[PDB]
Design a protein around this nucleic acid. Structure first.
Ligand SMILES: [Mg+2]
Ligand SMILES: [Mg+2]
Ligand SMILES: [Mg+2]
Ligand SMILES: [Mg+2]
Ligand SMILES: [Mg+2]
Ligand SMILES: [Mg+2]
Ligand SMILES: [Mg+2]
Ligand SMILES: [Mg+2]
Ligand SMILES: [Mg+2]
Ligand SMILES: [Mg+2]
Ligand SMILES: [Mg+2]
Ligand SMILES: [Mg+2]
Ligand SMILES: [Mg+2]
Ligand SMILES: [Mg+2]
Ligand SMILES: [Mg+2]
Ligand SMILES: [Mg+2]
Lengths: 236, 101, 117, 322, 45, 392, 176
RNA sequence: GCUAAACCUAGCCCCAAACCCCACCUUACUACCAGACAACCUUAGCCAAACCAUUUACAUAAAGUAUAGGCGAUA
RNA sequence: GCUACCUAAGAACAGCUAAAAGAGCACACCCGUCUAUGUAGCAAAAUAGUGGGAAGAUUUAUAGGUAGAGGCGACAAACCUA
RNA sequence: CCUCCGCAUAAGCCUGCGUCAGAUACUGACAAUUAACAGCCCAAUAUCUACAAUCAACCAACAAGUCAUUAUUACCCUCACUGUCAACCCAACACAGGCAUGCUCAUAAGGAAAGGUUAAAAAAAGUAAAAGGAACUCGGCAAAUCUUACCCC
């Protein structure tokens, strides 16, 4: 096939980017994932998951102003247009994030624990134990990859050594270098879990094609499986 | 000229000149009523209307006011004894409006 | 469905019909807004001579002698053009006699030919 | 399917063909601070106004003359409003479309499943005059209705197609520049700017030196006929209800330097064969040869400004309804 | 109901069975070679 | 996270043949063949550049080598700049104090009934109806058509007052006029390159509104700052510029003095259309730019308090909503954040009409709302006429 | 003038129009380059007139008066073109040694056939020309079988022709 | 007495000998713009073994011999 | 180039009731419930009447994609040039 | 008397009811469709582009949406090429089928159900029908009317 990924943009921007649906088809053209196809046309809004990204020629902790909080078609959680210095950028909005709020992004790990305030980004080592976090990075400077869905909140359990233990929303524990940044509070759109589709048409709008009509026998995997919680996933 | 490679022109190059013209044209009687100042020609397919204007103004010193061209499609419907279509050649028709009334 | 008929600009959708031509050599280029810029130097300029006083009618009198065909050759042209000067200056740097080391720098380059007809 | 008639036309001798299509007779002629302001507009659009982007000849018309003509119309209207009270309440339109659809003559279908059947010859004029003035009170007739003129309308011995003229089927529009609900329904003056394709220099190169006046005349005839016919049909007249009063309009057509002045009187909407079989009426278009407003503009000075041309424009703007 | 499976369109015709597409892949080159060997008057579509 | 995926990024050239790596031997490549063959080494073609200069195939020099490249970055505000903080940002950039409402000096020019146009309401209703319904053959004219038309028709209606005010013959309405003005604020080089809307140009300067006492009183007023948003946000940062103060016209041009900047937001789409606050900020910046260009032309390129303040009006509009501004530039000493400050009187969100019904809304075969404007506000047109008549 | 597109008015309608002999190559070779240049346009005007006569005769469904003079004019123009080409070729050979005016090269196309690719005029070098690089001038191994098959088809055709010729010759000898 | 009947050479088969102007890869037959992309990789199966599963052929003489082979079809 | 699904960017949906509805009646349009005719037929699946939907999970024009040990499938072992 | 229509564009086709002459909507020859409509575009390097549409105004939203540049450098000096016909395409056919869009919403445009006769059966379509009103039939299928209530899934 001649499939070329629409994700060719190289420069970050605030403008919604015109996407191209895949319908679950790989670059070879064959279906790789079923149940995807159609739905309302959407435009991608480039999200800056590296919350501590000091502006060019600048460094150190910096503040920003929340211009607005906007529904994002590409994400369960709604996003926020956060502007600082002479730049703007899309970020993941926390639960109680309103327009006009001030958001602090710092890389400083003080000897004491910073007073956690919802919406700000601090290194995990700077947070008090037990604070609710989101948009956690696997490695320092990698960028947020975990706890990004609507209403998801990780927990800061321990800060042994130069490492921090994070309870992910799936309850799995995660060891990360304390220098990696994570935002305070739970992700916005907390009531996303209580959304009623109502009609098959709404699923088709969202872009989920109906399940296959073929009847499958349920094997040994089907029965409820109670397992011990998996061990910590370490990144040190 | 036709059936000849035109020397490629680059910006600032010399003027393209043809010395022994290869275009041969026909002055044909119009098949329909035409204005008194209009002359109908059958032209080689590779000749532009600018080429026809220069041709008439240089070789025949005919003051040309306007030129229009159209590609008449020759019929391919006729068939020989072998049932193979006989192609009537397509030809270009040029309508030239004379100047100075 | 017709494969034996010639492919012309009269066949195909609007894009095909507009894009394909009929062999006419280009005269200029296209700029923004589909505006055509015509380059004068790209228009063939018919170098028509002055026929006044010309004595060669299109046909030749049938009362004319017949002569054997002697196609001109490089050797014959050299003998009839360069050989006399070569002999004179030998009895008494080929550029002086006429040889041109390179066609570059000429308006009419013999090879690669850069002139019409 | 109908012939699309282009007022500003590259067709040669198009004035005679338009005269035939319109039943119009063409007649040569017509039935200090202002000078300073005109020179000010010229110098504003040529020298004083700084251009960020370089101006090319192929866009010189649009980016120089069109603002120049707009400035002339606006400033002259403002300055002559005291001397023409009706001009004060007039509505000034910039490049507003003027559409007129009519029927003139009949033709036997040459080929097809409809061969041999009689079909009317429909024409549509879609003009975009650079400026135009619309009023609520109609102008006075230039010459009484039924004005018999010895000059005979030109006749076309071949099809209208032979003059470059092509047929299309799209919306039939009769439009004076504003919808019928607009009180300002009558026409006062139309300022036309000839396009670059119809440059005097281009015509001279193409050996159409005889066709400059032809282009001006054809543009005038077509545009003014369309405007007057649209006004008449807004008033309710049509082919079977021919106008009971003449419908007058004026036009000035310029190439940027040369101006020509035209007066048009519509006396006939009965252009179809049925309504024209025994119709003595015929529309009239008075026109003047193109004259240069100025000879040349050198830096900060305009050379040889034509007070006569300026006064012609002023007189057209000063014409008032009775 | 059936029979009219051919909905002609020159774009599809040339993009599916054209000279360029036939030469694009080695298999199509061999198709053209087979047509030439057989002596077909129409190598491509 | 790096934007742009590998599959879309330019493909890496294939690895070079080991024949090139081998030192002492000259590789055999298909360069002589003048075409690719898979069984010969790939040539290393030397870089090529056409000997002659060819427009339509011209590549600009790299940015740093441009003659006008400068390390100091100039922040340019143009017709399509949408300030994030809007009016606050414009006021900070221009060192301006805001006064709500138009000044009494201009507002009183329409109080006297003589300046009142005959049949103001009917004429303005006709103008609105022509702009919004009767303009074109299209059933519902678009903003791109009815915004410039409504502005021009209102200007013509005002110009009809030449009978009462002969001084209106000393002004013209120029289009495509562009001005440029540069100045420093807190060591930030800011330029305004204003183009687009129409410019009313008079033969005489506008009289000053604020008195010297008020100008001095502006000293106590302090520019409202906004943190962490910098005043530079949304302004085009440019390292290749030319610091020049251009009034848009050659010297000696008649009608030199700007009198009103008629700015129109004729974009059909809401996102492409300026917000009211951003439009007011644009009006502030363009009025300041024109006034500063006039000041630089007249009193030279000197940072000083103007003894004769420059007055420039502006009318921003979206076809329905209008914003009126009168800007008095009384100081070219913009770098310092303290001292006398320019001052702008603003009247915001003056809507000429609430809505226009191009078609008659019918409910159960009953016409609920007739065709035409609804909620017409003649006060907005009175303010428009007051601004037009100011100076005459 | 347009009258040059038609024969003499006196000649109009004549059943037969007498014409001289077509120019011969040897006769033309004695004429100067300027003389040949002028004679080319003389013959071009005559050819246009004769083609006009032919088309009008077809329109009127009548024979063209003296059709042979059109062939005479075509032959004269061909001879003039041949003489000019001979002079140009001799000069090119003398000054450069190239026997072809247009550059070209023997190249193997995608089908394995050896062709004379005639070079075209380009503004950019070949290694940068995208379309030229798309064009392929080499045959992959899978073409060898088809090359052999085409060779064998040609050999079969030639063998059939030769055997038929021998059979016909033997029949002729037996008959006579 | 109508449909019709016939006809002899167009050619072909097997051997020997002998080795064989312009346009066109873009939508081919399209004058005239920054490429980068490049080829190689066991045949399988039918079928026979009366199924099928290992297996099953692709000058003369030695010789259908030595050998191989569900030691069997066969090789 | 049919058809199954998908990709890009388009188009269509009168009127009435209701009111932001995979709402109702009902055109265009899509489909094909039942009857009759037809069964070498107008048609290698149609016609007439009747009927379901007809602002949506709709219909549909254009171009592109997925290829047989496969594709696609709201599984009918459907459809992939009769 | 009919009018589903029809006229254009798109797509498709490619001269396929124009004239002349021969034959017996065919053959041969001659002619034709003329650009303004449409196609055929854009010099770079960076840098911009949060705020639907729905008469866009209230409102209501969700499925979150077709519509934008600037800065510098280059650059004007010279309107080509191609489609344009038709009773037309996909269905082996002058096939009752398939066939996108804009107007016309019954027409100004486009058409003809009857080769002539007779008025047998059988057959098809339709209309009317005394009294009865499902007694027919597997079943109210069909037709005619506009019609209640209860179940299974
Ligand atoms: Mg299931
Ligand atoms: Mg054309
Ligand atoms: Mg289809
Ligand atoms: Mg077996
Ligand atoms: Mg057996
Ligand atoms: Mg509806
Ligand atoms: Mg519904
Ligand atoms: Mg099943
Ligand atoms: Mg089953
Ligand atoms: Mg009949
Ligand atoms: Mg009968
Ligand atoms: Mg009964
Ligand atoms: Mg019963
Ligand atoms: Mg009952
Ligand atoms: Mg019974
Ligand atoms: Mg029933």
């Amino acid at each position: 096939a001649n499939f070329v990924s629409w994700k060719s943009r190289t420069k970050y921007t605030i403008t919604p980017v015109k996407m191209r649906k895949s319908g679950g088809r790989d670059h070879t053209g064959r279906i790789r994932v079923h149940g995807i196809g159609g739905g309302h046309k959407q435009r991608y809004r480039m999200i800056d998951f590296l919350r501590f990204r000091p502006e060019e020629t600048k460094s150190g902790p910096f503040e920003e102003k929340v211009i607005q909080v906007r529904y994002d078609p590409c994400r369960s959680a709604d996003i926020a247009l956060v502007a600082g210095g002479s730049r703007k950028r899309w970020i993941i909005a926390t639960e109680n994030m309103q327009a006009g709020d001030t958001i602090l992004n710092s890389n400083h790990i003080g000897r004491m624990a910073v007073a956690a305030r919802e919406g700000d980004a601090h290194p995990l080592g700077a947070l008090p134990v037990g604070t609710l976090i989101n948009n956690v990075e696997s490695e320092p400077g990698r960028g947020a990859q975990y706890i990004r869905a609507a209403g998801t909140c990780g927990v800061l359990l321990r800060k042994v050594n130069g490492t921090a233990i994070i309870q992910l929303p799936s309850k799995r524990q995660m060891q990360v270098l304390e220098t990696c940044v994570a935002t305070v509070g739970r992700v916005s759109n907390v009531d996303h879990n209580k959304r009623v589709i109502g009609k098959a048409g709404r699923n088709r709008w969202l872009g989920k094609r109906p399940n296959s009509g073929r009847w499958h026998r349920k094997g040994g995997w089907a029965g409820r499986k109670i397992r011990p919680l998996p061990p910590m996933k370490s990144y040190v | 000229a036709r059936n000849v490679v035109y020397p490629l022109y680059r910006l600032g190059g010399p003027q393209l000149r043809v010395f022994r013209t290869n275009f041969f044209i026909q002055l044909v009687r119009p098949g329909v009523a035409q204005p008194e100042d209009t002359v109908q020609f059958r032209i080689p397919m590779e000749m532009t209307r600018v080429d026809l204007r220069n041709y008439l103004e240089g070789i025949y010193n005919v003051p040309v006011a306007a030129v229009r061209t159209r590609v008449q499609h020759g019929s391919n419907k006729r068939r020989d004894h072998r049932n193979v279509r006989i192609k009537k050649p397509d030809y270009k028709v040029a309508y030239v409006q004379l100047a100075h009334g | 469905a017709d494969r034996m008929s010639k492919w012309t600009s009269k066949r195909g959708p609007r894009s095909f019909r507009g894009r394909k031509g009929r062999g006419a050599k280009g005269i200029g280029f296209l700029t923004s807004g589909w505006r055509f810029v015509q380059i004068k130097e790209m228009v063939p300029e018919f170098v028509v001579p002055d026929l006044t006083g010309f004595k060669l009618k299109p046909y030749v009198s049938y009362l004319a002698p017949e002569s054997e065909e002697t196609p001109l050759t490089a050797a014959q042209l050299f003998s009839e053009a360069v050989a006399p000067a070569i002999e004179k200056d030998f009895k008494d740097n080929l550029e002086k006699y006429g040889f041109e080391p390179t066609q570059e720098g000429k308006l009419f380059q013999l090879y690669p030919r850069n002139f019409l007809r | 399917m109908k012939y699309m008639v282009y007022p500003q036309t590259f067709a040669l001798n198009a004035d005679r063909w338009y005269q035939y299509f319109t039943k119009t007779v063409f007649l040569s002629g017509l039935p200090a601070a202002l000078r300073a302001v005109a020179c000010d507009c010229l110098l504003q659009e040529h020298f004083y106004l700084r251009r960020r982007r370089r101006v090319h000849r192929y866009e010189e018309s649009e980016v120089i003359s069109l603002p120049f003509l707009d400035q002339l119309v606006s400033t002259l209207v403002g300055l002559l409003s005291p001397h023409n009270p009706a001009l004060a309440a007039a509505a000034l339109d910039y490049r507003c479309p003027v559409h007129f659809y009519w029927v003139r003559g009949e033709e036997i279908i040459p080929r097809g499943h409809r061969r041999g059947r009689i079909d009317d010859l429909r024409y549509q004029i879609d003009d975009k005059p650079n400026n135009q003035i619309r009023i609520s009170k109609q102008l006075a007739e230039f010459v009484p209705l039924d004005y018999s003129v010895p000059i005979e309308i030109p006749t076309i011995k071949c099809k209208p197609d032979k003059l470059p003229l092509f047929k299309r089927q799209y919306e039939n529009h009769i439009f004076v520049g504003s919808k019928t609900a607009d009180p300002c329904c009558y026409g006062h003056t139309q300022f036309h700017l000839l396009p670059d394709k119809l440059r005097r220099e281009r015509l001279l190169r193409q050996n159409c030196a005889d066709q400059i006046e032809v282009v001006f005349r054809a543009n005038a005839i077509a545009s003014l006929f369309a405007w007057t016919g649209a006004q008449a049909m807004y008033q309710g007249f049509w082919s079977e209800a021919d106008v009971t009063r003449p419908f007058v309009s004026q036009a000035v057509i310029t190439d940027g330097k040369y101006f020509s002045f035209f007066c048009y009187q519509l006396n006939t909407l009965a252009l179809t064969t049925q309504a024209d079989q025994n119709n003595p009426r015929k529309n009239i278009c008075w026109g003047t040869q193109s004259k240069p407003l100025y000879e040349t503009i050198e830096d900060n000075d305009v050379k040889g400004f034509n007070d006569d041309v300026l006064l012609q424009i002023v007189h057209f703007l000063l014409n008032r309804p009775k | 109901a059936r029979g009219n499976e051919y909905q002609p369109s020159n774009i599809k015709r040339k993009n599916k069975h054209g000279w360029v597409r036939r030469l694009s892949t080695p298999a199509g080159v061999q198709v053209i070679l087979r047509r030439m060997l057989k002596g077909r008057k129409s190598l491509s579509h | 996270y790096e934007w742009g995926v590998r599959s879309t990024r330019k493909s890496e050239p294939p690895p070079l043949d080991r024949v090139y790596e081998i030192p002492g031997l000259e590789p055999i490549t298909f360069a002589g063949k003048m075409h690719f063959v898979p069984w010969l080494a790939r040539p290393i073609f030397p870089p090529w550049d056409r000997g002659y200069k060819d427009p339509r195939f011209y590549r600009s020099p790299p940015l740093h080598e441009h003659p006008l490249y400068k390390d100091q970055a100039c922040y340019i505000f143009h017709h399509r700049c949408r300030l994030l903080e809007g009016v606050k940002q414009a006021l900070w950039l221009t060192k301006t104090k805001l006064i709500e409402g138009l000044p009494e000096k201009v507002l009183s020019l329409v109080d006297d009934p003589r300046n009142h146009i005959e049949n103001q309401d009917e004429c303005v209703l006709n103008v609105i109806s022509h702009a919004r319904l009767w303009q074109t053959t299209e059933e519902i004219p678009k903003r791109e058509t009815y915004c410039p038309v409504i502005v021009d028709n209102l200007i013509q209606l005002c110009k009809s007052q030449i009978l009462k005010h002969p001084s209106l013959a000393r002004r013209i309405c120029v289009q495509n006029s562009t001005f440029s003005a540069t100045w420093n604020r807190e060591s930030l080089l800011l330029q305004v390159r204003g183009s687009g809307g129409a410019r009313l140009s008079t033969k005489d300067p506008l009289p000053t509104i604020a008195s010297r006492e008020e100008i001095e009183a502006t000293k106590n007023h302090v520019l409202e700052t906004f943190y962490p948003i910098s005043p530079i946000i949304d302004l085009h940062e440019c390292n290749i510029y030319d610091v020049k103060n251009d009034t848009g016209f050659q010297e000696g041009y008649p009608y030199p003095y700007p009198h009103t900047l008629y700015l129109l937001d004729k974009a059909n789409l809401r996102p492409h259309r300026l917000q009211p606050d951003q439009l007011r900020a644009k009006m502030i910046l363009f009025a300041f730019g024109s006034a500063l260009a006039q000041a630089r032309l007249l009193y030279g390129n000197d940072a000083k308090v103007l003894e004769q303040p420059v007055v420039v009006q502006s009318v921003g509009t979206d076809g329905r909503v209008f914003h009126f501004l009168v800007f008095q530039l009384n100081t070219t000493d913009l770098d310092c954040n303290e001292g006398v400050k320019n001052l702008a009187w603003v009247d915001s969100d003056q809507l000429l009409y609430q809505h226009f019904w191009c078609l008659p809304v019918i409910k159960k075969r009953v016409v609920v709302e007739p065709v035409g404007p609804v909620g017409f506000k003649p006060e907005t047109f009175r303010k428009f006429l007051a601004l037009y008549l100011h100076g005459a | 003038g347009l009258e040059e597109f038609f024969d003499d008015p006196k000649n109009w309608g004549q059943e037969k129009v007498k014409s001289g002999a077509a120019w011969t190559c040897q006769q033309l070779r004695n004429k100067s380059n300027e003389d040949l240049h002028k004679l080319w346009y003389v013959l071009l005007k005559e050819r246009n007139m004769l083609l006009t006569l032919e088309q009008e005769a077809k329109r009127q469904r009548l024979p063209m008066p003296s059709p042979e003079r059109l062939d005479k004019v075509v032959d004269s123009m061909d001879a003039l073109d041949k003489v000019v080409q001979e002079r140009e070729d001799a000069l090119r050979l003398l000054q450069t040694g190239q026997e072809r005016a247009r550059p070209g090269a023997w190249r193997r196309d995608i089908f394995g056939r050896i062709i004379w690719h005639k070079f075209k005029q380009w503004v950019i070098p070949w290694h940068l020309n995208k379309r030229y690089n798309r064009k392929r001038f080499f045959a992959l191994p899978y073409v060898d079988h088809f090359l052999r098959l085409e060779r064998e088809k040609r050999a079969r055709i030639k063998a059939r022709k030769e055997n038929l010729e021998r059979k016909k010759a033997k029949i002729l000898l037996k008959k006579f």
